[PDB]
Each structure stands twice: as C-alpha cells, then as structure tokens.
Amino acid sequence: APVRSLNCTLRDSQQKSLVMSGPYELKALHLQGQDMEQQVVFSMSFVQGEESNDKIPVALGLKEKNLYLSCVLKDDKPTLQLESVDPKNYPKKKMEKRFVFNKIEINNKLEFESAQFPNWYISTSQAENMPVFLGGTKGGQDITDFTMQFVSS
C-alpha cells in the first residue's frame, strides 16, 4: 500500500451528516444526541490522476467495509452508488474514474466531481431524510458543496 489512507467524516454545508440507512444506501439528515453513533466514516485515499492546483483525485472507501463509492450510469443518467471492490487490490495508488473523485476547494468548501462524468458532483437534498445521489446542478437548489473533517483514533 504505497498510498496514504485518511479517516474522515463528511458533512454538508447545512451541518447534516451522512448515515448508512441501508447496505448500499446513505442518507443525509440532522444527526445529534447519542444517535450520533449513527455517523459513517469514510477513508479517503490520495490516489494518482490529473493533479492540479485545486483538483486532488482521491478515493472514498468506507473504513469499516471495503465498499467504495462509484459513479455509474443508470439508464443513461449518472448516479451515485456503493460497490464492493477487491479487499486485496484496493486501496491502490491507481483507481478507475468511477472511484476517483476530484476534490475541489471553493470558498472554504469542498466539491467532489465524478472523474468519470465531469460537471456531475455529489449532491444532497435539503429535504429531511433523503438518499445521497449524483446531480448535475451546481449550487442552485441542490447542495453540491460539502465539508470534510479529519478524525482521530
């Protein structure tokens, strides 16, 4: 593993956290109180790719399980979904676009663009209790920005 993983949680610009409501499904909602234990933890991994000044290609893989987020088409329409990869070959310094997310920085906020489908980032619904998905709507009404936070052990 000539790479470097990084434990970290993800919160939207509204302060809501992401929770694994199902096996291959995540939900963004107001999490607080002891129910806080329902917070997920992704392990980012700085991989190789088009390195720029703000674009930092990485890979989000659940720390607990080997499920890596991936952007796949669902009827000619891009979408976000979890896919179990190889616990032996991953994490690796090289990753397919599906698992590569260009972490961009804009106004102290983060933006993950699907290395596979540019212009499509990870967005959430301001609505309460709503599955996370891939959307092609910069700002506007959908929340595409995010906020990562390093965690310790």
Residues 9 and 151 sit within 8 Å (Cβ to Cβ): yes
Q: Chain-centre distance of CA 87, in angstroms?
A: 19
End-to-end C-alpha distance for the chain, whole angstroms: 20
Total number of domains constituting the chain: 1
In terms of residue numbers, what domain contains 100?
Answer: 1-153
Q: What is the DSSP string of 115-130?
A: SSSTT-EEEB-SSSSE
The DSSP letter of residue 66 is -
- In the chain, the amino acid numbered 106 is I
- CB burial string 90-118: b at 16+ within 10 A, e below: bbbeebebbbbbbbbeeeeebbbbbbbbe
Experimental technique, in short, is NMR
Provide the CATH number for the domain around residue 64: 2.80.10.50
Burial (CB < 10 A; 0-12, 13-18, 19+), residue 132, is buried
Alpha-carbon distance 145 to 139, whole Å?
7
Token look-up 């972490």 returns 103
What is the residue whose two structure tokens read 């000539």? Answer: 2
Q: Compute the Cα dihedral for 79, 82, 86, 91 and give only its sign.
A: positive
Entry field: residues in the chain: 153
Q: Pinpoint the alpha helices (H) of 26-149.
A: none
At 31, phi and psi to the nearest 5? -110, 130
Cα–Cα distances in angstroms (integers) from residue 138 to residues 10, 18, 25, 120, in the given order: 18, 20, 23, 8
From residue 71, alpha-carbon distances to 2, 60, 124, 134 in Å are: 25, 12, 15, 8
C-alpha closest to that of 114 among 53, 51, 59: 59
- Listed residue (80, 15, 72, 8) closest to 40, CA to CA: 8
Task: Confirm if 111 and 118 have CB atoms less than 8 A apart.
Answer: no
- Strand, helix or coil for residue 18: strand
| Cα distance between residue 27 and residue 128, in whole Å | 9
